[PDB]
Design a binder for this molecule. Structure first.
Ligand SMILES: COC(=O)[C@@H](NC(=O)[C@@H](NC(=O)CC[C@H](O)[C@H](Cc1ccccc1)NC(=O)[C@H](C)NC(=O)[C@H](C)N)C(C)C)C(C)C
Lengths: 99, 99
């Protein structure tokens, strides 16, 4: 898998069985997703960026299958315009930015 | 170079001579920076981010020297909390996201 980046690096991930489209973001410290409900045990958290900050619901031990791999990881749920797979999951997949 | 992503892929860039700390961002289609002076021949653009939109001044063909390569591209000036070098400049550098 190599993303040349001429187009957004989006891929399909299965987060606890749900297919979700996701952007591979090296500029994101965390992974935020909308549209999937992961349940009642989470930690309110806040994440910020261009535009401001949003409130998120942080989940642990989330089962995700992306690019042919199955990893367990932390996902945040919240008011996001696009689903993001941040650096915490990209390191878990062994993905790297190269020049 | 290879940037594994255990820490933020922040690098040093010179935008028309001016140095600035920049985040190489695959989740950014555009490059937005702040604290750099540019040529008042800009066109107002709007840029969306996590939780919001900010007012931007768009400059075309700005000369940039980053990661030892000289490049040219559109950079947006705005009150961004993080200086971002998006895909328009990453592709120009020849960067790739790899698994
Ligand atoms: C916990 O600490 C934090 O929250 C840290 N924040 C971060 O790490 C945040 N990183 C970030 O906020 C880094 C920026 C992200 O990569 C977003 C992703 C995005 C794309 C499209 C639409 C919406 C959002 N890109 C953008 O905002 C770019 C400028 N937008 C665009 O390219 C538009 C869509 N053309 C994440 C929370 C998303 C910190 C740097 C403040």
């Amino acid at each position: 898998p190599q993303f040349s980046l001429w187009r957004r690096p989006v891929v399909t991930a299965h987060i606890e069985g749900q297919p979700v489209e996701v952007l591979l973001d090296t500029g994101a410290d965390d992974s935020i997703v909308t549209g999937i409900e992961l349940g009642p045990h989470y930690t309110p958290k806040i994440v910020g960026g261009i535009g401001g900050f949003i409130n998120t619901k942080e989940y642990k031990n989330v089962k995700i299958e992306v690019l042919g791999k199955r990893i367990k990881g932390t996902i945040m749920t919240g008011d996001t315009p696009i689903n993001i797979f941040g650096r915490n999951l990209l390191t878990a997949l062994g993905m790297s930015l190269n020049l």
